[PDB]
Structure 1
Amino acid sequence: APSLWKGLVGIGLFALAHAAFSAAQHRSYMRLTEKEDESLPIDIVLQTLLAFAVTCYGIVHIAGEFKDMDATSELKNKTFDTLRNHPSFYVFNHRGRVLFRPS
């Protein structure tokens, strides 16, 4: 699912860049002709807005973490058996060591 969102964001960005290039070409043409104070075509403007709205949808989905506020829920599954052992104090005196010693 994240890969699809990333690809969609990339495609939208590419479409936005293409719309920018089209608008640049339109203004370059406009500078050629005297007067003619007209606006850019509405179709490419709508394409620009479509590319802007699509890229803002995946930009929120890509980073969604929203962790739980309460601090009791993560330790709701953890068992006291694992907590009983600690990594500081480890005594290396067990029957498994002499049982696994030959093999």
Structure 2
Amino acid sequence: SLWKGLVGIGLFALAHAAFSAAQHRSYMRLTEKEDESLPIDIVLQTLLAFAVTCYGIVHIAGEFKDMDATSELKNKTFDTLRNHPSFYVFNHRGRVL
């Protein structure tokens, strides 16, 4: 179940990016520049977090299945089919034991 760890790592890194960017914004409003864009590093970090997280969530999302009924009948025999549990009766050899 490594894909779970992968997703948690993506999330942690993304949160780190958000924190870094908030404090950078504070720097901006403090130095009254309000002209410049974000440093590249934050951008790359968040984007890779996003991509990795999607690649992992696709895996852990589940698993597809055929829509042809007889696929799940390939392995089956009368012994299962015949029992009819709501019509059971016990007056048979086993009661000896």
TM class, shorter-chain normalised? over 0.9
In the TM superposition, what is the alpha-carbon distance from 1:64 to its structure 2 partner? 2.6
Residue 49 of structure 2 aligns to a residue whose secondary structure is helix
Q: Encode CA deviations 1:10-36: one digit per residue, 9 max, x unaligned.
A: 011000000000000100100001235
1:52 has 2:50 as partner:
yes
Choose 9-18 or 59-68, whichever is displaced more.
Answer: 59-68
* Alignment correspondent of 1:42: 40
| Among 72, 91, 94, the residue aligned to 1:93 | 91
Normalized per residue, which structure has more helix?
Answer: 2
Q: Encode CA deviations 1:57-98: one digit per residue, 9 max, x unaligned.
A: 111100232111100110110111211111110001111121
* Alignment correspondent of 2:71: 73
Q: CA RMSD in A?
A: 1.0
Residues matched between the structures, number: 97
Residue 23 of structure 1 aligns to a residue whose secondary structure is helix
Unpaired stretches in structure 1, ≥5 consecutive residues:
none
State the identity %. Answer: 100
Unpaired stretches in structure 2, ≥5 consecutive residues:
none
Structure 1 segments, 4+ long, off by >4 Å, are none
The alignment's TM-score, normalised by the length of structure 2, stands at: 0.94
